[PDB]
């Protein structure tokens, strides 16, 4: 009695691992109570296929927009800026929708503050390249041009 798992399951469980259990635990509790299934070989591919059409399929289906920053590898047109201040230095901050203002017409339009650098955001020159939240892995690169008026 080997059988494969469905749900977690205490001292062996794992959503689909390959266990080998006493016949009783199984034909008395695990199965006929939705938790496992005889490893009928028919199944050891039926629940191994997934392990391919998924853990090597949909884990690749993720890679279709590398870095998401594709043809934006040459910065973006600087429509306006992101502000300034302190007669020379910096003083003003980014409202909850004010890092777009510059890159405010490139990709798609949004308006949210998924803050990434929990600092007082350094006040100097202006043009910087950190990362920002583009996804749970990749990044992006652009700059920031001030406004002289």
């Amino acid at each position: 009695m080997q059988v494969i798992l469905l749900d977690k399951v205490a001292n062996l469980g794992s959503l689909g691992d390959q266990v080998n259990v006493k016949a009783g635990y199984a034909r008395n509790f695990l199965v006929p109570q939705g938790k496992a299934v005889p490893a009928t070989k028919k199944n050891i591919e039926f629940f191994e296929a997934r392990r391919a059409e998924l853990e090597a399929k949909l884990a690749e289906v993720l890679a279709a927009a590398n870095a998401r920053a594709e043809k934006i590898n040459a910065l973006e047109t600087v429509t306006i800026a992101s502000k300034a201040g302190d007669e020379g230095k910096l003083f003003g901050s980014i409202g909850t929708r004010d890092i777009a203002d510059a890159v405010t017409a490139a990709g798609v339009e949004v308006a949210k503050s998924e803050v990434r650098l929990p600092n007082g955001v350094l006040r100097t020159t202006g043009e910087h390249e950190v990362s920002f939240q583009v996804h749970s892995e990749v990044f992006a690169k652009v700059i920031v041009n001030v406004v002289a008026e």
Partner: protein, 77 residues
Amino acid sequence: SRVCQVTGKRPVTGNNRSHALNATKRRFLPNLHSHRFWVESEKRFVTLRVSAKGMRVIDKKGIDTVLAELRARGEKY
């Protein structure tokens, strides 16, 4: 009728044989048990009269296949 519903296993006859090699008519008879199986295919407990082994057979071929027989053979279940 001590008869395993899955494998047909009924009791048999044989001797005893002492040290003296003395023949004595006996029976061997199946290790039957009757057990409540859950089907899900029918949301019910079909409770067969089964010999262990019969059990092992269900544990491999699958109840839905074992009841597939019987049904196909005429048996109640």
